[PDB]
A paper describes a structure:
Jumonji-C domain-containing protein 5 (JMJD5) is a 2-oxoglutarate (2OG)-dependent oxygenase that plays important roles in development, circadian rhythm, and cancer through unclear mechanisms. We have shown that JMJD5 can catalyze the diastereospecific C3 hydroxylation of specific Arg-residues in synthetic peptides based on the sequences of human regulator of chromosome condensation domain-containing protein 1 (RCCD1; i.e., R141), with which it is reported to interact in cells, and the 40S ribosomal protein S6 (RPS6; i.e., R137) in vitro.
Electron density corresponding to 20a, 20d, 20h, 20i, or 20j was clearly observed at the JMJD5 active site in the respective JMJD5:2,4-PDCA derivative complex structures. Note that in all five structures, the side chain of S318, which is adjacent to the 2,4-PDCA C5 position, was observed in a single conformation in which it is oriented away from the C5 substituents of 20a, 20d, 20h, 20i, and 20j. Thus, the 5-aminoalkyl-substituted 2,4-PDCA derivatives inhibit JMJD5, in part, via competing with 2OG for binding. Similarly, an electron-donating OMe substituent para or ortho to the methylene linker of 20a did not improve the selectivity of JMJD5 versus AspH inhibition (entries ix and x). By contrast, the side chain of W248 occupies a different conformation in the JMJD5:20d and 20h complex structures, i.e., it faces away from the phenyl group of the C5 substituent of 20d/20h. This is likely because σ–π interactions similar to those observed in the JMJD5:20a, 20i, and 20j complex structures are unfeasible, either because the phenyl group para C–H is substituted for a para C–OMe (as in 20h) that cannot engage in σ–π interactions, or because the distance/orientation between the phenyl group of the ligand’s C5 substituent and the indole group of W248 does not favor productive σ–π interactions (as in 20d). The observation that except for 20e, all of the tested 5-aminoalkyl-substituted 2,4-PDCA derivatives inhibit isolated recombinant JMJD5 with similar efficiency indicates that the σ–π interaction of the ligand’s phenyl group with the indole group of W248 is not essential for potent inhibition.
Author numbering: 182 to 242, 246 to 416
């Protein structure tokens, strides 16, 4: 079934029906008027950030590596010029690096329902072409994933389903599923087929609440820019 969409729910409604129980929801009417929604084109990003160095993941989390290049180089090589490989400006605190871009976003008011300090909220950029794919994984904090450019297909599995997701057994990867969500090996991972899940296509202006430790899988359907807020 699908992730519910709610227009600007009250803090109490979000707290009681989603945050405390740990249920995903898409928040509408919250980020849809942030300046990033109209301002962030490739041209604007090049103007404000083009000369800055960013980490770039090449390949798939299959070979995989991490390199460094300017935002201009990343756009030229992995977005516009028939890219030879998938490259992803992933999980980077771009707004600490470039404060002028921080003016174009806000911290969702709902974060103030957490027990942590606003100063400790981690804001990550996720800027990449169509076709970037995460592994199915879980994170140790709450998350508001804000979609700015393009759309993402997202699949969500409750932590109650962890047994059917076959986490890696190394300590380093125990938060990551061994399963390819969209083409699972059911001969090796048979419990995966009957694990229930939620899914959605997250579109610009929408915020997906990913509860702490909820398993999530993310595939970009277009040229995409998302901003995640990791909070507690
Ligand atoms: C090289 O390819 C990848 C591909 C995907 C990834 C990780 N994917 C995500 C994880 N987490 C969040 C989140 O907000 O917690 C968002 C995304 C996302 O892609 O939007 C890393 C490298
Ligand atoms: Mn994540």
């Amino acid at each position: 079934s699908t992730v519910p969409r709610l227009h600007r729910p009250s803090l109490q409604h979000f707290r009681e029906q989603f945050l405390v129980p740990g249920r995903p929801v898409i928040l509408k009417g919250v980020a849809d008027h942030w300046p990033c929604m109209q301002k962030w084109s490739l041209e604007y990003i090049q103007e404000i950030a083009g000369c800055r160095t960013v980490p770039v993941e090449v390949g798939s989390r299959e070979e995989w590596s991490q390199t460094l290049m300017t935002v201009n180089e990343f756009i030229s090589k992995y977005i516009v010029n028939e890219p030879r490989d998938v490259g992803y400006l992933a999980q980077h605190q771009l707004f600490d690096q470039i404060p002028e871009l921080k003016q174009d976003i806000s911290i969702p008011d709902y974060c103030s329902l957490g027990d942590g300090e606003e100063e400790e909220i981690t804001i990550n950029a996720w800027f990449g072409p169509q076709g970037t794919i995460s592994p199915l994984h879980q994170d140790p904090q709450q998350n508001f994933l804000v979609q700015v450019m393009g759309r993402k297909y997202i699949r969500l599995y409750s932590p109650q389903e962890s047994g059917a997701l076959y986490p890696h057994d190394t300590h380093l990867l125990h938060n990551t599923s061994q399963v390819d969500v969209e083409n699972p090996d059911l001969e090796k991972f048979p419990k995966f087929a009957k694990a229930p899940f939620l899914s959605c296509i997250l579109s610009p202006g929408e915020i997906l609440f990913i509860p702490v430790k909820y398993w999530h899988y993310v595939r970009a359907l277009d040229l995409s820019f998302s901003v995640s807020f990791w909070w507690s």
